Amino acid sequence: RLIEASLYGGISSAITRSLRDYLLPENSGVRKAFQDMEAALRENRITLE
């Protein structure tokens, strides 16, 4: 998308729609703590099912 938008020129519609998806990096720190803390419950629930 980046390359071809540059090739034809103009304000790309697709880039404009998903602006946050392109310009912001995804951060794992906020998440993995809670995945590990959540683990004991997840396993228990799956076992019960």
């Binding site: 310009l23 912001l24 951060n27 720190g29 906020v30």
Partner: protein, 50 residues
């Protein structure tokens, strides 16, 4: 719990805002016809701010 999570979220938000602000300065005073500058405007949604 609680406050510490809020602090890490706030610091991440602050760092992203600052980096964007740095990128933003490189684009000042670019002349394209009648356009004279470009910016990436970053804001925080209310429903999440509260």
């Amino acid at each position: 719990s609680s406050k510490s999570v809020a602090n890490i979220i706030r610091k991440t938000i602050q760092r992203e805002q600052n980096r964007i602000r740095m990128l933003n300065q490189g684009l000042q005073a670019v002349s394209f016809g009648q356009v004279r500058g470009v910016r990436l405007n970053v804001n925080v949604r209310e429903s999440h701010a509260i």
